[PDB]
Every structure is written in structure tokens, then in C-alpha cells.
Amino acid sequence: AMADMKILRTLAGYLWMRDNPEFRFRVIAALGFLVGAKVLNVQVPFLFKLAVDWLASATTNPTLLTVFATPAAVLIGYGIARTGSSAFNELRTAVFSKVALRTIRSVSRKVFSHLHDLDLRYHLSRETGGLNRIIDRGSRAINFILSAMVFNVVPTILEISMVSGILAYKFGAAFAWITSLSVGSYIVFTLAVTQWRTKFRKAMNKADNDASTRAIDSLINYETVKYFNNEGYEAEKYDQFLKKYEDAALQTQRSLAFLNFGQSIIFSTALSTAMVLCSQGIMNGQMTVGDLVMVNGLLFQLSLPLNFLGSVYRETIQSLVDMKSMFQLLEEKSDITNTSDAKPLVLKGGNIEFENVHFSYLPERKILDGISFVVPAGKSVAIVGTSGSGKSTILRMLFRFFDTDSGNIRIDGQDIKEVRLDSLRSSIGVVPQDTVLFNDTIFHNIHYGRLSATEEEVYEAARRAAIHETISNFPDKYSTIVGERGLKLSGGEKQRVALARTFLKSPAILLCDEATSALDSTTEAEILNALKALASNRTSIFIAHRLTTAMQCDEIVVLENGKVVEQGPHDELLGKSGRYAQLWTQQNS
């Protein structure tokens, strides 16, 4: 199909690079080795003919091409024929393997580079645990398929060419017709069975992927199932999915088998018809002069790839589907594309203004209806209010994760839409909604703030976050492995790692999502004071509905149902008897 053509074109483009002529040299050498090996294979039965007819003569020598006396040397060379055939087949794989592995490396490189380019609207909801499975299966699929494609499929047509070349001796005058008819009928039957089996297999792969997703989700949420003693429930669900895959595979496997019977009988008759015509001519052309052996031989060397084609068909219908799935991954469109006239941003001072911004995560429901406020340079603002009002969304747009529906965003009198992403993102620092850590050292995960920083910068950074007091009690200094998702550490430790990451970068704009979420009063008061003198540039935004941590901020904004309701400093805001007054009089108690 056209999709297969595009896949082949992309594969050929990735394989063939014009920078290095040494690659073309390798390809030409591999082709030469293939041609030599197949020529030797065709030569084998032809040279075996002289042994047979010489024995028939023994039962003079018209041909002078013979330089021997006893046919034993002929049989020695007959063995040497397959020896050399293997030898030339040997060197072909060695040359092609390097370029095959280079292609694998380049493809995996491109896929990994491309995946992080996509948007949160993909990676947040349409990331079903198993993109790793797709990449792993496809990467293994590519090497197998291209290794299969060159090593056995390509030489088969060339052997067909030589068996169609055997007509020069007046033998194959019809054998060419029979072989062409058999090949065409076999190809038609194979494609018909293949389309039918793809029709019956589309349900198989769909069922298979869901079971792995269920298993990976069960592994990820192991704590909950251990809490609620419901292991049998995931057990039964995985059983049902596996039974569905069982039925799908069993139905297909019997039908996949039937092709092997069809392939064998068609080509058995092809050899049978070759026997019949050879039997018809009782005259000397095709009786007892060896041509029966080559016809048994040469058309059987065409039957050598028959063993591959029937046997490897099970994975061909499976891996190629996974190939298209993984290649389909390299055609998605980045939702957030920078403007054509991309221009870097330079700020004399961080001033942020909203001009009636509207955003909806889904088109039907609009979370926020009108937001307009200004962030003075040299000061800071706090965002407090009831939950569910999208107050972490308001800081998910300044980083251009999503694009607003109808509104304007201004930083230092510059358009966020117009400015470059790299200048935008590297100038503003954030602490995430739920802290996530790498599977490496705590020192590496705290040094991630600026990858070119020094150890003393890291050590002084931990002093600002006041974690050396806990560090001195470490069992391993700056080397405790923190697990898969920072689980090994505590809540306060996980939250204090992210803050140190932000301070190490020391960005121009601060963006705090959770401050003092899981910290005691003494630590949080120290962090806030440590976050005022240092670690905070002249612009910073806090979203924290704890009242004591929004005391220090210059401006307080109240968000309810997406409308920015009440504004003002703390002293006036308490006397207004607004939502802020209700919230504060409760926490103060």
C-alpha cells in the first residue's frame, strides 16, 4: 500500500547517507558477496552433472573442460562449492551488520529526540504506559526485518532469475512458464491470506496491548492494591484480557497454518510438473544425462527460501504492524510551535500582565472566564482561594505548556507568543505540582539545577534550603539512591529537593506551585526567610492557600471558579470581609 511505500522510503532514507562513500562501498561489497554466493550455489548442481554422466559413461570424454581423471576430485570440488557458498554468505552478514546497527542507533536516536518535543496534551493523558513497550518492540523489529529483507528475500528473486536463465540449454523452454505461474499464484494466495489474517489480527494486537497496560498500571499502583486487599480483582481482569488474547491467537494460528499447506502443495506440483515434462521426452535431451538432478536441485535451491517464507511469516505479520505503529509515532504535530519570526527576549525587569485571558482544557467546559492583573517588577504576588479554581493552570501558561484561547500575555512589554521558547523557558523557574525525581543520586538530582555548576555551589545550595542538618545524618553522604520516583525519601525531603533545584538555577522569574506543603512551622518559616533574602529574583509568584505563607507577599489575588474576584494587600483585604477574610479567620482560629 501507500503507507508501506512511505515506510520503505523513510527506511531507505535513514539507511542511505551520502556523506560517507564508505557506506556505499560496504553496500556494494555486500551485493558482490551475495552475487558470488548465489552464482556458486547455481554452479553446484551444474558441476554435479559431470559426475553423474561420467559414471553413466563408465556404466571417451567429448568435453575438454574436464581436467581430472577420477570423479572423486569432482566430488571434492562439489563439496568445495557449498564451502565457498557459505564463505561468501559468511562475509555478507559481517559487512551489513555494522550498517544495520548504525540504522538501529539512528532510528532510536531520532525517536527519543522526537518524543520529548510533544506537548502535555499528549504526554499527560494519551500517554498509556507502554510507549516504552512500543519503542522496545519496534527497535527489535527493525533489525530483524531489515536483516531478513536483505539476507533471504533479495537473493530469492535472483535465484528465480537464474532458474529462468537455465532456458539457454533448451530445457526450461516451458519450465520458465510453469515457474512464473507458480510464483504469481503463490504471491496472489499469500497476499489474499495476508489481508484476511490482518483483518483477523487487528483484534489480536488491540487485545494484547490492553493487557500489558493493565499489568503496568497494577505494578505502578501496588500500594493501593496492598492497602485494599483486592489482588484477586486485578488477577481476574488480567485473566479476562489474557483469555481474549488467547482466543484471538488461537483463531488466527490455525488460519496462519493453512498458508504453509497451500505454499507447499503449489511448489510441490511445480517440481512435480518439472518431473512430468522431463519424463515425457524419452529422447536424449532430458534422459539420464544429469538434467533430472539439476531440475531436482536447481528448483530446490529456489525452495530453500520456501523454508524461510513459511516459517518467518508469523513474525512478519506481527513485527511489521509494530513497525508502522512506531513509525507513526514520528509524524505527530507539536501543538505549541514557535512563531516564524522567533526573537529572543531580554528583560530589564520582570513585569507580567494579563489581558483578559480565556482558557479551556476541553472545548465544552471553560474553567476560567476572564483574568486580568499586573505583576509589578521588584515585587511578588500570592494566589489564594478555594480549590478547583485552576490556580495551578494560571502558572501552566506562563511556561507555554498550552496556548490560551482568547487573551494576551505580556512580560516586560513583550509578547509571550512572539518571543522564543528557549529564551522564555530558561529564564523562568518552577517547582512542580507533584515532585518527581530521577533514578540517580540525591547529589545528581540536586545538581540538575545547572548541569555546569560546581560541588560547592551544590553544597551552598543545600545550606539555603537548610537540608545539611538532615544531610549530616545521612547513611551515605550525597549518594543515597532515591528509587523510582523519590519514594525512598520522605515528603519533606522530596519537596526540599525540588526547591534546591530551583535555587541552583536561580532563574529570573520564580514560579512556586507548592510551598510548605509538607513542612513543619519551624522549617517553613526558615525557608520563607531564606527565600526572601536570597533565591528569589525581583519577580516571583506563589500559589499557596496557607495563610501564613502568603503574609509576606505584596499582592494577594483570590480565584474562584475562574474569575479573579478580590484583590489587594493583606491589611485592607482582611477588612473587606471577602473570601480571604473567611479563609484567614478559620486557619487563624
Ligand X SMILES: Nc1ncnc2c1ncn2[C@@H]1O[C@H](COP(=O)(O)OP(=O)(O)O)[C@@H](O)[C@H]1O
Task: Cite the annotated binding site for ATP by residue number.
Answer: 361, 385-396
> Cβ closer to ligand X: 387 or 588?
387
The answer to whether residue 328 forms part of the interface with its own copies (CB under 8 A) is no
Q: Among 10, 43, 128, 190, which residue sits at the site for its own copies (rule: CB under 8 A)?
A: 128
Q: Among 137, 391, 400, 496, which residue sits at the site for ligand VO4 (rule: CB under 6 A)?
A: 391
| Contacts of its own copies in 339-368 (CB under 8 A) | 362, 364-365
Cβ 498 vs Cβ 438: under 8 Å: no
The answer to whether residue 380 forms part of the interface with ligand VO4 (CB under 6 A) is no
> Cβ closer to ligand X: 208 or 493?
493
> Cβ closer to ligand X: 394 or 510?
394
Look at residue 255 and give the partner it binds from ligand X, its own copies, ligand VO4, none, a contact being a CB closer than 5 to 8 Å depending on partner kind. none
Binding residues (CB under 5 A) for Mg ion: these are 392, 490-491
Within 8 A by CB and 6+ apart from 131, the residues are 115, 329
Count other C-beta atoms under 10 Å from residue 321's C-beta. Answer: 17
> Cβ closer to Mg ion: 83 or 490?
490
**Stretch near ligand X under the rule CB under 6 A, chosen from 244-252, 262-270, 369-377, 488-496:** 488-496
DSSP 323: H
**Stretch near its own copies under the rule CB under 8 A, chosen from 261-269, 338-346, 410-418, 564-572:** 261-269
CA distance 509 to 427: 7
The answer to whether residue 492 forms part of the interface with ligand VO4 (CB under 6 A) is yes
> Cβ closer to its own copies: 109 or 532?
109
| Contacts of ligand X in 361-390 (CB under 6 A) | 361, 367, 387-390
Q: Among 61, 180, 240, 307, which residue sits at the site for its own copies (rule: CB under 8 A)?
A: 307
Cβ 329 vs Cβ 118: under 8 Å: no
HSE, CB side, 13 Å, CA atoms: give it for residue 584: 19
Cβ 174 vs Cβ 277: under 8 Å: yes
* CA-closest candidate to residue 160, choices 190, 136, 131, 180: 180
Mind giving me the DSSP string for 251-293?
HHHHHHHHHHHHHHHHHHHHHHHHHHHHHH-TTGGGSSSSHHH
Q: Among 197, 400, 501, 545, which residue sits at the site for ligand VO4 (rule: CB under 6 A)?
A: 545
Look at residue 195 and give the partner it binds from Mg ion, ligand X, its own copies, none, a contact being a CB closer than 5 to 8 Å depending on partner kind. none
The answer to whether residue 283 forms part of the interface with its own copies (CB under 8 A) is no
* Cell numbers linked to 164: 529462468
**Stretch near its own copies under the rule CB under 8 A, chosen from 16-24, 53-61, 160-168, 531-539:** 53-61
**Dihedral sign, Cα of residue 191, residue 192, residue 196, residue 197:** negative
Within 8 A by CB and 6+ apart from 460, the residues are none
* Cell numbers linked to 500: 534546591
Chain positions contacting ligand X, by CB under 6 A: 124-125, 361, 367, 387-393, 488, 490-492
